Design a protein around this ligand. Structure first.
Ligand SMILES: O[C@]1(CNc2ncnc3[nH]ccc23)C[C@H]2CC[C@@H]1CC2
Length: 167
């Protein structure tokens, strides 16, 4: 039993809610919140911009030190950093950005990072400003993640389409 509330159960391990991931994180304070990161950990917009703003830019400061030490992530890769005031940990995961021409097959590799964590609050990878089809992202999530994932979908109109079209 966990403290996630109001989610629709899609499968054995995947749950979905129309919610602002920032507000969800502040309420639940989960062990792991997933960020929709880029390889440079430049949290300018989308989910990343919103999560970073909620940390008063502390996420960006930590991220800049991480990149200065380690260099960029791989598309499809991840790193674990602090969750600041939002969660114990933040799993920064880089899904392919279709608006940069990146290979959508890497979306499965991106979701595989979730399997290293028993429970996660997460957005749909590569959705929003990363330009992938969120219906496809949900399908890859369900077919790849085996740990317990609670998906927050900000857009209510999108949330309803994801549920009604879910196979
Ligand atoms: O890019 C996404 C993800 N963006 C977010 N998802 C959850 N909480 C959030 N808080 C701030 C931004 C944000 C994927 C779909 C739903 C919303 C947008 C556009 C389409």
């Amino acid at each position: 039993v966990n403290s996630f509330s109001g989610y629709l159960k899609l499968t054995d391990n995947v749950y979905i809610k129309n919610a602002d991931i920032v507000e969800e994180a502040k309420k639940v304070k989960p062990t792991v919140v997933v960020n929709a990161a880029n390889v440079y950990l430049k949290h300018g917009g989308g989910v990343a911009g919103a999560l970073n703003k909620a940390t008063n830019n502390a996420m960006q400061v930590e991220s800049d030190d991480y990149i200065a030490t380690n260099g960029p992530l791989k598309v499809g890769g991840s790193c674990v950093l602090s969750g600041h005031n939002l969660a114990k940990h933040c799993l920064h995961v880089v899904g392919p950005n279709v608006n940069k021409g990146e290979d959508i097959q890497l979306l499965k590799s991106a979701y595989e990072n979730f399997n290293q964590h028993e429970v996660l609050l997460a957005p749909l990878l590569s959705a929003g400003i990363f330009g992938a089809d969120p219906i496809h992202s949900l399908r890859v999530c369900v077919d790849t993640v085996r740990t317990n994932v609670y998906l927050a979908v900000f857009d209510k109109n999108l949330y309803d389409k994801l549920v009604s079209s879910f196979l």
